[PDB]
Amino acid sequence: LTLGNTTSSVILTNYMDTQYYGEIGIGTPPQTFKVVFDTGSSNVWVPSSKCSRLYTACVYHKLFDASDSSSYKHNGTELTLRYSTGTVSGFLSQDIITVGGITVTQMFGEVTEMPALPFMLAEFDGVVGMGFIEQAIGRVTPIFDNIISQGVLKEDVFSFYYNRDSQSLGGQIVLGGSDPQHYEGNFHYINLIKTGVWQIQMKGVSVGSSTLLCEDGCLALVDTGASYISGSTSSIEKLMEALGAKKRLFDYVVKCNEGPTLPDISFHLGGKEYTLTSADYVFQESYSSKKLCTLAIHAMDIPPPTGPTWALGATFIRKFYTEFDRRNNRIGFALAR
Numbered sequence: 406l407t408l409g410n411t412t413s414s415v416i417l418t419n420y421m422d423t424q425y426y427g428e429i430g431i432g433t434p435p436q437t438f439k440v441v442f443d444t445g446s447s448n449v450w451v452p453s454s455k456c457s458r459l460y461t462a463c464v465y466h467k468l469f470d471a472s473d474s475s476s477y478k479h480n481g482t483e484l485t486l487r488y489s490t491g492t493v494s495g496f497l498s499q500d501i502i503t504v505g506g507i508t509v510t511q512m513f514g515e516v517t518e519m520p521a522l523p524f525m526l527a528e529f530d531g532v533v534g535m536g537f538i539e540q541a542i543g544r545v546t547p548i549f550d551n552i553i554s555q556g557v558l559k560e561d562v563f564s565f566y567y568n569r570d571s572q573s574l575g576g577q578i579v580l581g582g583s584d585p586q587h588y589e590g591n592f593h594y595i596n597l598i599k600t601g602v603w604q605i606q607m608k609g610v611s612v613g614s615s616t617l618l619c620e621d622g623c624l625a626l627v628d629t630g631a632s633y634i635s636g637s638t639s640s641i642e643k644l645m646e647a648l649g650a651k652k653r654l655f656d657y658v659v660k661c662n663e664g665p666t667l668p669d670i671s672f673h674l675g676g677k678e679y680t681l682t683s684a685d686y687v688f689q690e691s692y693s694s695k696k697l698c699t700l701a702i703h704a705m706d707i708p709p710p711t712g713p714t715w716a717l718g719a720t721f722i723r724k725f726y727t728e729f730d731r732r733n734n735r736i737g738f739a740l741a742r
């Protein structure tokens with residue numbers, strides 16, 4: 406590890422409090438893409454010009470064309486990348502990637518198979534995995550490791566601010582630090598269970614008064630690429646019975662008028678209770694007894710070995726500015742502002 410004196414920031418767009426993405430450039434001259442920065446995965450991919458237009462997702466997204474880039478390096482190894490909400494497939498390529506200040510030579514997936522559900526619902530084009538090399542498909546070096554190798558970042562850390570939803574900043578990633586403008590009070594740290602996954606021990610989940618969930622302890626994936634807080638089908642059907650909420654296809658709803666008096670939900674991480682108020686986890690889009698309001702908490706059964714686990718996504722990170730510390734293998738939380 407070599408440390409320099411560089412901090413680099415990426416500005417994010419917030420779409421409807423569900424999608425947070427920024428821009429990268431790939432190739433010479435730069436081809437620009439909207440990407441989610443996802444601590445829950447370790448690969449880079451964008452849609453490829455070689456994607457058949459029978460994938461409607463490839464008609465509606467920006468496609469990388471290797472034939473327009475003088476800095477492209479062929480590889481051609483096939484790979485498949487499995488996300489919580491769906492799967493993409495394609496092949497490895499190498500090119501120059503620009504993110505914030507920084508230019509890095511990077512191996513990434515050119516995606517040629519991009520299912521319409523869910524990718525026709527994506528405002529973003531692809532993904533930049535901020536996870537560890539241990540979970541990288543094809544054992545490809547992740548972008549942050551490649552950036553650390555350059556020895557220009559002040560610290561072996563990166564940080565996420567996600568805003569609530571023209572003039573407002575949707576969010577901000579800091580590579581090599583934190584922005585004290587977007588948090589207050591002190592960082593509280595939890596150690597990773599292990600290097601290789603941004604996953605920490607959780608000691609309990611309260612609904613108001615009572616620890617009625619994860620009573621014997623459980624896992625929390627701190628997942629910048631997940632919209633919601635997620636638990637297993639079994640944990641969530643309990644949480645949602647206790648909130649008086651009903652299942653739609655994939656999510657849970659409450660009568661809009663009941664939203665504001667739903668109880669506080671607390672997550673016990675390291676020393677502290679991380680408390681969400683109903684305003685933090687209800688899409689309070691109306692106060693009518695005659696409309697339904699979605700909850701920013703749903704069921705996700707993440708397969709072993711990472712899961713079963715909770716995932717703390719944008720619902721959580723909106724309240725708690727999050728620092729991901731590779732040097733000391735830990736996660737810091739502070740109150741966002």
Ligand SMILES: *[C@@H]1O[C@H](CO)[C@@H](O)[C@H](O)[C@H]1NC(C)=O
Pocket residue numbers: 479480481482497
């Ligand atoms: C693809 O990339 C990997 C990782 O560096 C390399 O070891 C492999 O030989 C490459 N294959 C081709 C065919 O260029």
